[PDB]
Amino acid sequence: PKQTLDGNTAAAHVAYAMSEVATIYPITPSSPMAEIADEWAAHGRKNIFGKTLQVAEMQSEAGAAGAVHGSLAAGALTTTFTASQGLLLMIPNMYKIAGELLPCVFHVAARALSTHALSIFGDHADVMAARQTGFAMLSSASVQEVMDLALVAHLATLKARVPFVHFFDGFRTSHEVQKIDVIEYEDMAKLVDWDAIRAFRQRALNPEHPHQRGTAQNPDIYFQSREAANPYYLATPGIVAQVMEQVAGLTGRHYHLFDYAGAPDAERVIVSMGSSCEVIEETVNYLVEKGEKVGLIKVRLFRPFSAEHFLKVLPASVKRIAVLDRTKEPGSLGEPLYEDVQTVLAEHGKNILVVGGRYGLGSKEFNPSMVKAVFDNLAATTPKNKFTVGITDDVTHTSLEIKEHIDTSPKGTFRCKFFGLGSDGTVGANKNSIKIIGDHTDMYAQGYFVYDSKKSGGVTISHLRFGKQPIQSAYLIDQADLIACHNPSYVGRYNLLEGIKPGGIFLLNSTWSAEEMDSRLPADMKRTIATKKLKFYNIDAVKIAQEIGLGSRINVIMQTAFFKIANVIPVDEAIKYIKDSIVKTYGKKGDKILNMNFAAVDRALEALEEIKYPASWADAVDEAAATVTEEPEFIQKVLRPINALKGDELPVSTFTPDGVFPVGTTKYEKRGIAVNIPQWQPENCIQCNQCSLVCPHAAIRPYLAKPADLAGAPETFVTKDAIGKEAAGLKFRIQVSPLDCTGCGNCADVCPAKVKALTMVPLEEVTAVEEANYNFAEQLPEVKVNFNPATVKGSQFRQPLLEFSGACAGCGETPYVKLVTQLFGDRMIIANATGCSSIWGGSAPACPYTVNRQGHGPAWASSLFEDNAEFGYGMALAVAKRQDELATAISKALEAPVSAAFKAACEGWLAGKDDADRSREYGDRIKALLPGEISQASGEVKDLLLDIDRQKDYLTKKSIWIIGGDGWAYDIGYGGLDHVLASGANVNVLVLDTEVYSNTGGQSSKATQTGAVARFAAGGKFTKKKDLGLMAMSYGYVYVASVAMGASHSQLMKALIEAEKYDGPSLIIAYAPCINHGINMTYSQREAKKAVEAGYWPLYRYNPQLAQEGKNPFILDYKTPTASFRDFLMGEIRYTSLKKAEQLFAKAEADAKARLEQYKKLAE
């Protein structure tokens, strides 16, 4: 049958049918494969064995790989899905699985490896890192090929006994939606070699016919034993070839080990692999028809590399070959595929000039214009070798010049771009539009979706294609017949109408009339509309949704507007298909919700009005650009073009060679995405600063100023007298940053005044006023104040060093990290695990960590997902070594003829170098005496002072903070965290416990509670939550504390300060509410208060220092809960969606009572 799927679903479809067990672990962009396999098993989909697939989630891909190995050796057909860093961790087991000749298929959504930077996007770096393990390797070039070649892999591995890696390009194919022919399970079972399966069962570990495998071997037999598998690898090419003929007879689609396309007498041929083959064949069709003698060899079976099957499809007329590798091996002579082609042609004496290049790293665009550039390089007198395509390499001059732009799209193919807002329904509607068109017409349909790094308020760009011919355009849309803008704020911000065809359609969602078009639309946009004679349509979708009662949801409205003008299908047919999908989507919502969406369709058709623009729009002239402010060179050359969606134009000379970025760059973004912003009521404010404490974006802060410093304040900068003996004679004001606020509403909810001192007002109404207000508050001079930093009020007067990050509105993680920077950020180094905290904390080119007025601030680094604890441990060793080198130079200065005041500060530092306050005090004293002491010295004594000055950045004692999520701490990095805590080093571990893998969409974890439903746990998690805090207490010398900011501000303050001062390992497990819980983020602080009050989350502190004082180390800070446990679960969707459901809710309540009663015994 025909369905609209992506590569992931296409792969999981075949993997599910052919497997009994699937051990999985989430990693983008492979996790959708494991998610859908869990849902199918949850609803009882049967594989070819008549049973449901058993899905088991491990603690890491290393654990997943071992489970695959054991399951295979014991007699169960087992598969798994992974990519990128996950595939690296499976490499050790891959040698074993291949070495033991076990049938197996790994499905890989090929993704780049973390080098100078992390990239979740697609290339072959991961697959190439395992090409020597002995696995076979099969490449799929399209979503249709994923369906077919996944079947080829599963059938071939049973026959050959050689395990397979079936890989397809991450995102470019794994997330591309296409209408394909789906192969029925019943047809798969008719092709399976059942004799091969039964032989596999007989080789299983079984005590009734036992055997020994995996022995240790001496040099006398190891080499021979390793070569004994030679026949199995020699027979694999023919086995795969015969399987491809089986699939060919069933589907009609013919695959070979290497496939050729292009002129039979071609002289220039490109050898490539993966989705690039689709782009190359489309270009080859275009060039061959124009008379060029070019061709393409698609590599399907990369390993084992069959020389016979490669030469079989190479035309005898080939004189020059360009090999394209989607990877980079630095310092290597050439990339993998290039060296293979060069080798095989040498082994057979072919006089063919071979040239290799690199493309598409990290989902870099690879379009037909680049393909011609590769072909033109083969047509040159001396073809450039070791080249790159798709970048401008102005440093080493490896890039090919893209001279001209060609349009190789098949005639009759419709192309549309949709600019949407984060979670406004645009992407979901386009997926439904593809499903509508694919199911009811003969046209092929394709969809690809570009997402934003910002988690809330980001830009989404949808790329859709429909045509009478199969769609091989695995690249972004170049010339669009229709461009739709579902957010009017994008007008004048992004190049929306880029590349639109003459006479194309421009659909806009805005409240602007035809006359307001002259003043609202920019001149460059008006020129394109007029010169290209576009059909410009406008619709006020927001007005329609308000009047009907759908709020601001415009997804149904904008989809109706598309079909009305696109002329892809009859307008009357589309309306039926839209309303039919509404019944499928809103049928269970009720009669009221159903008819509202029906009215949305009807009202949208009548409201879509074509804008009749004057022809004089073609001559419009840009308006004079204002005098731009002097911004740093990085902001001007890097951050602005990247946020302007022009980062691909930046040449190689723009970037550092090691991925090092400046700090404090998010303050230049000023996204202004808030719908409402807090307005401060000075008369109701008690000056408690709790609003600044809970802000997940540091958008609201308190400001103090002497009355003289309030001179040039705007009239709206109303201040109040400062409360407290510390701030006597000063003015106070709570000021919000309107362009950086997210409109989450946490600060208004936490305000404890009798009358609310914060009220949510629309941004547009007060944006002009509050911007000048914030610009004045930010320019206020520093005020020396003696407020105790150990209190909530006093700590918020210190500058936040984490601001304006990309976390969601109301995130429960950033308030914890923001508070740490306010206490110790002056002297801390952060080792941050991969996860949400690394995405909002370190997504290029914007850095949310900033500096104070002295230029000091946290240094931030992210290594890997699994190594963060050991990463920070290594930092502690190095910092200790750097202080030791400084202490030696200071002790040498004591014997030098230096000033008596210099010797006093040196001795004071040497005695207190391991104390935070004393080392800063005497450290700053030495800094003040350094310039004068150097001037008064000469010769070797001056050199000794210059060495101290070179190391003055290590006088102040540092504070190592190891930050990461619960998935890192409870699963993949738990072994390393256990080791670093047990070592006794002076490190501080902060676990942001969201009880799921939050960044990757919300998958199951050991931090997930009993009965909670998450991805990979569709039926709910049976086993209870692992108690990480209890295991760290078992050492006795590890400080462990469980905190929750929403529950108790004072309890969080005490545990953080006690943990940092403790000269040893400290573990802070913080409850972080998240969007994956299925709750209203406006009341994110309130949800954490209900969690502790209902006995769901405990609050305790284990202080090893109390044991040395003869006291009880365990202190239970909240003993008696006052709220109902069952009522808290019903306030989050992650528990209500389960409603077998009642049995799990009862087990969760029994575990919460036993956990509280166990803490009462440890406290008594």
Ligand X SMILES: Cc1ncc(C[n+]2c([C@@](C)(O)C(=O)O)sc(CCOP(=O)(O)OP(=O)(O)O)c2C)c(N)n1
At 416, is the secondary structure helix, strand, or coil? strand
Kindly list the distances between the CA atom of residue 733 and the CA atoms of 698, 718, 766, in Å, as whole numbers in the listed order: 15, 7, 17
Q: Residue positions in the annotated binding site?
A: 28, 111, 423-427, 455, 555, 597, 685, 688, 691, 695, 741, 744, 747, 751, 808, 811, 813, 836, 966-968, 994-999, 1074
- Contact letters (x/-) for ligand X, 57-96, by CB under 6 A? ----------------------------xx--x-------
What letter represents residue 118's amino acid?
Answer: L
Secondary structure percentages of the chain, helix, strand, coil, to 5:
40, 15, 40
The yes or no reply on residue 994 touching Mg ion (CB under 5 A) is yes
In 529-668, DSSP assigns E strands to 535-539, 609-610
- Applying CB under 5 A, among 998, 1008, 1009, 1048 the residue interacting with Mg ion is 998
Instruction: Choose between 309 and 1006: whose C-beta lies nearer to ligand X.
Output: 1006
- Applying CB under 6 A, among 6, 38, 540, 866 the residue interacting with ligand X is 866
Tell me the β-bridge partners of 831.
861, 962
Scored b (16 or more CB within 10 A) or e, 521-558 reads beeebbbbbbeeebebbbbbbbebbeebebeebbbbbb
For residues 304 and 164, what is the distance between their CA atoms, to the nearest angstrom? 10
Q: Which does 654 bind (CB under 5 to 8 A by kind): Mg ion, ligand X, a second copy, none?
A: none
- Applying CB under 6 A, among 566, 751, 955, 1055 the residue interacting with ligand SF4 is 751
In 929-1056, DSSP assigns E strands to 959-965, 988-993, 1039-1043
The answer to whether 28 is a known catalytic residue is yes
List the catalytic residue out of 8, 23, 111, 326: 111
The answer to whether 111 is a known catalytic residue is yes
DSSP state of 182: P
Tell me, by CB under 5 A, how many residues bind Mg ion.
5
- Contact letters (x/-) for ligand SF4, 765-804, by CB under 6 A? ----------------------------------------
Instruction: Choose between 375 and 865: whose C-beta lies nearer to ligand X.
Output: 865
H or E element at residue 732? strand 731-736
Residues numbered 550-579 forming contacts with ligand X, rule: CB under 6 A: none
Helix residue spans in 19-124 (DSSP H): 31-42, 61-74, 85-99
Instruction: Choose between 1016 and 1159: whose C-beta lies nearer to ligand X.
Output: 1016
DSSP state of 635: I
For residues 644 and 671, what is the distance between their CA atoms, to the nearest angstrom? 12
- Applying CB under 8 A, among 179, 298, 454, 1006 the residue interacting with a second copy is 1006
Least distance to Mg ion, CB of residue 844, Å = 22
The yes or no reply on residue 1105 touching a second copy (CB under 8 A) is no
The answer to whether 157 is a known catalytic residue is no
* Region label for 482, one of left (φ > 0), alpha (ψ between -120 and 50) or beta (otherwise): beta
Q: Could you identify the residue written with the tokens 């394209």?
A: 324
Instruction: Choose between 723 and 982: whose C-beta lies nearer to a second copy.
Output: 982
DSSP state of 615: G
Instruction: Choose between 26 and 1104: whose C-beta lies nearer to ligand X.
Output: 26
Q: Could you identify the residue written with the tokens 């984490």?
A: 802
Strand pairing class (609-610; 1039-1043): unpaired
The answer to whether 999 is a known catalytic residue is yes
The yes or no reply on residue 1022 touching a second copy (CB under 8 A) is yes
- Applying CB under 5 A, among 6, 145, 478, 966 the residue interacting with Mg ion is 966
Instruction: Choose between 143 and 758: whose C-beta lies nearer to ligand SF4.
Output: 758
Q: Residue positions in the annotated binding site for thiamine diphosphate?
A: 813, 836, 966-968, 994-999
Residues numbered 799-838 forming contacts with ligand X, rule: CB under 6 A: 813, 833-837
At 1042, is the secondary structure helix, strand, or coil? strand
Which stretch, 257-265, 399-407, 682-690, 995-1003, contacts ligand X (CB under 6 A)?
995-1003
Dmax (CA) of the chain: 95
Which stretch, 122-130, 741-749, 826-834, 977-985, contacts a second copy (CB under 8 A)?
977-985
Tell me the β-bridge partners of 560.
none
Helix residue spans in 258-306 (DSSP H): 276-289
For residues 1114 and 1103, what is the distance between their CA atoms, to the nearest angstrom? 7
Q: Residue positions in the annotated binding site for pyruvate?
A: 28, 111, 999
Q: Which does 798 bind (CB under 5 to 8 A by kind): Mg ion, ligand SF4, a second copy, none?
A: none
Q: Residue 686 has which token pair?
A: 């008690």
User: Is the distance from CB of 76 to CB of 93 less than 8 angstroms?
Assistant: no
Q: Of all residues in this chain, which one has the CB nearest to ligand X in the complex?
A: 965
The yes or no reply on residue 994 touching ligand SF4 (CB under 6 A) is yes
The yes or no reply on residue 455 touching ligand SF4 (CB under 6 A) is yes
- Applying CB under 6 A, among 18, 27, 67, 483 the residue interacting with ligand X is 27
The yes or no reply on residue 1163 touching a second copy (CB under 8 A) is no
In 783-900, DSSP assigns E strands to 828-832, 859-861
Residues numbered 691-710 forming contacts with ligand SF4, rule: CB under 6 A: 691, 695, 697, 699-700
For residues 463 and 1041, what is the distance between their CA atoms, to the nearest angstrom? 49
Q: Which does 966 bind (CB under 5 to 8 A by kind): Mg ion, ligand SF4, a second copy, none?
A: Mg ion
Q: Which does 990 bind (CB under 5 to 8 A by kind): ligand SF4, a second copy, Mg ion, none?
A: none
Strand pairing class (268-273; 320-325): parallel
Is the CA virtual torsion 1060, 1066, 1071, 1074 positive or negative? positive
Helix residue spans in 402-531 (DSSP H): 426-440, 517-520, 523-531
At 849, is the secondary structure helix, strand, or coil? strand
Least distance to ligand SF4, CB of residue 502, Å = 43
The yes or no reply on residue 1031 touching a second copy (CB under 8 A) is yes
Q: Which residues bind Mg ion (CB under 5 A)?
A: 965-967, 994, 998
Q: Which residues bind ligand SF4 (CB under 6 A)?
A: 455, 678, 680, 685-691, 695, 697, 699-700, 734, 736, 741-747, 750-751, 753, 757-758, 807-808, 811, 813, 836, 840, 994, 998-999, 1074-1076
Q: Which residues bind ligand X (CB under 6 A)?
A: 26-28, 85-86, 89, 120, 813, 833-837, 839, 865-866, 964-968, 992, 994, 997-1000
Which residues are known catalytic residues? Answer: 28, 61, 111, 999
